Symmetry: C3
Subunit: 259 residues, 3 copies
Amino acid sequence: MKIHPTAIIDPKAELHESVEVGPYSIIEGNVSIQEGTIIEGHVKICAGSEIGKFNRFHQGAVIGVMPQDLGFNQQLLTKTVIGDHNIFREYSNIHKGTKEDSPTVIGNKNYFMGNSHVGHDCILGNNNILTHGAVLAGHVTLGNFAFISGLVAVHQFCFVGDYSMVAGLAKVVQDVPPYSTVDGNPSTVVGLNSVGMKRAGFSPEVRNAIKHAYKVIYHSGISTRKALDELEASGNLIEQVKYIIKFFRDSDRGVTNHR
Amino acid sequence: MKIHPTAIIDPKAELHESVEVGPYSIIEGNVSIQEGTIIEGHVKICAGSEIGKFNRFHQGAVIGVMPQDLGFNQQLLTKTVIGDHNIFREYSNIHKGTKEDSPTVIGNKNYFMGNSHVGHDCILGNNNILTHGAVLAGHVTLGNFAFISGLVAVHQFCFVGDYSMVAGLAKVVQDVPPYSTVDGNPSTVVGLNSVGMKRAGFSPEVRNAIKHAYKVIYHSGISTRKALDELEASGNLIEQVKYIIKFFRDSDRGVTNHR
Amino acid sequence: MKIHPTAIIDPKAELHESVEVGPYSIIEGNVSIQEGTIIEGHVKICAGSEIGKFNRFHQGAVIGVMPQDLGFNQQLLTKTVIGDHNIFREYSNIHKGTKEDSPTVIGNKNYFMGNSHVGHDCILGNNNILTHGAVLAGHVTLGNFAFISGLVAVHQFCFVGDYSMVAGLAKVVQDVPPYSTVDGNPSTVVGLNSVGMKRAGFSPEVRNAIKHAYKVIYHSGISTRKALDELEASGNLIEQVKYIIKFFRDSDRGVTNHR
Ligand SMILES: CCCCCCCCC[C@@H](O)CC(=O)SCCNC(=O)CCNC(=O)[C@H](O)C(C)(C)COP(=O)(O)OC
Ligand SMILES: CCCCCCCCC[C@@H](O)CC(=O)SCCNC(=O)CCNC(=O)[C@H](O)C(C)(C)COP(=O)(O)OC
Ligand SMILES: CCCCCCCCC[C@@H](O)CC(=O)SCCNC(=O)CCNC(=O)[C@H](O)C(C)(C)COP(=O)(O)OC
């Protein structure tokens, strides 16, 4: 495949022969890019970038740029780890990590819309969608199949659970629980993300069991600590409900207030 | 006029001889650009772009980029239709349509501020202002002389009426009625856009007749369905009030809740 | 130091010999850039730019672009004034002023994060932080050490006091008082910015004296006009409290509503 004449690629960058690089794009040293990845014009791939297979980088996307962190030492060799089949739209912005053993990690099949931003040391699983203009602070963690709507800001050190929805313009300051929808400023858990669960093809029995868990947690007139104890003492739970309980117990900032 | 040496323009692109194209801009095939249009550096004009007279494209503006739509077939020849005397500011982002007979349409004398975004299949009339960082989802419709403030997000399939105002950071999930101001998250109709009507030079009689319509609709202790019936049964209405009634009746998502 | 072969720099631009300019960056005439400033690729520096020492301009940053002001005459020679040790992150956007004697002014040691925007005729002191995606309208004034969080919009003609915090996604329509935190849509003064005061190393006595002032202003069941009179009649005040009183008295739009 074809690399454009005007593209500036460091001799040490390692690119599979199938990789395409468009006009006026800049690829630095200490970069690896695997099979079938396409890079369009004015794209910047910074030192430390490890890029998987069949990714796309649309015009002006910047990958592995310096952390927006005043205390970060810019002489450090830090990394951005990107999996397979990811789409980075125009002027999307991905920051590298802040320590050697602490990269920014993106899994597979994620979609980063135009102008979207991933801060230093974020960790992101698979099949997530970052909508236009949305910003993740440093150290934000996404699971799999999370949907972040347009112009959302997510506070540092928050966790976004599997199959969750964050609505347009929501200000997220605490965790987004799995299978749930969060909305507003101040943001609240509005309810279940039934749209995400149905599209995923969760059985009605699994959907009802997730419903039951959150009924106990949020709709039974009892504290969250008592609620989680109640669910464990109820019997053999499905993996999804086990996951809800763990997500609540392991929370660093706490879970977003329910509406 | 003058096209910059380093600009990459497909031989099949049709540009009036007066068209200026700045440094490192990229113009693809299947593009037409009419008289007096100026394109500055690092601008991208994609296949399908039909561009009228005396437009300006500021640095890094991207026109007719692929829809941010997971199901869209990227082999399809879809279009972006732009009228005359439009201003696209820096890194503004306009997406092409999703079907052959369904283009993204922009009329005349519109202003798209830096970082503003127009999603796939939007339809936009004349003299509208899209302020810095504002995002329209796919299938958003603007009339004429609408003002969208900074960092607003407009939900897909909403209609924004003539001479309306959307305030900074408003989250719009339903229609913005004509001559009105919408604000907040959740957003509400706050009242009339008297500033927009006065600048437009609506007579005091027309302004009062628009006032009366919305008095009946929103300030008379009656449902919106009853209100619209009341207005029709009142006598020969002015065009503007006829338009208000039609806008309410034809709404797909409904009209934003009143404050 | 080194200017990249493909960089387009007007012969009349005045650059200290230490200035570095990266690939495909564009520097116009009527520009001055002092010692130790580094410009990376795809950066645009427009006519009127006065740039101090040891600044950094990250990829795609645009400096001194035309005001987003419909009435502004584009034939006018207006200016952007930038001090020392400022960091402009990727695709950050700074607009020049609207009159000869009215430049956009940036002091020293400020941080403009990716996609951040400074509107025409803004005035900014020292050590301020403009977080990712945040937008200042035209004629916004920042003091020193103000922190504007991600995706904030600040209304034109507002003043942001020293050592203040504006939270993520806040819609600012009135002044942000010094030493205070503002949050929400609609935004309110939530309380003191103790984090900013402690990091600054304000003595406990100064912090308590700032606390006392705002106790009188906001927490004593009296109007703001009566409150300011009370504070003046109390005795010899510290500079910081004198500043609070002046900031309230000289306000053009008024000070943001307290929570
Ligand atoms: C509401 C969160 C908005 C997220 C903005 C994402 C912009 C992308 C910036 C990243 O590329 C680098 C950073 O990560 S720069 C840190 C940005 N974070 C803030 O601007 C929030 C206030 N910043 C703060 O320092 C913490 O938010 C506070 C400690 C002030 C909140 O207090 P708290 O943790 O007790 O929560 C109630
Ligand atoms: C509040 C709207 C925020 C608008 C964000 C504009 C970003 C630009 C994206 C476009 O370049 C491509 C799309 O058009 S991608 C669809 C983006 N829209 C959303 O992120 C809203 C939630 N997304 C949804 O799927 C619908 O908003 C819901 C069906 C979830 C809401 O339910 P609902 O229709 O019953 O309304 C109460
Ligand atoms: C809530 C403020 C949001 C700030 C958006 C910043 C985007 C950057 C645009 C600048 O690069 C050029 C301008 O400065 S373009 C003016 C942008 N300002 C607005 O969109 C606010 C509504 N615009 C207005 O005209 C005034 O906000 C109103 C007079 C309508 C409010 O009325 P008001 O002053 O009585 O306040 C209650």
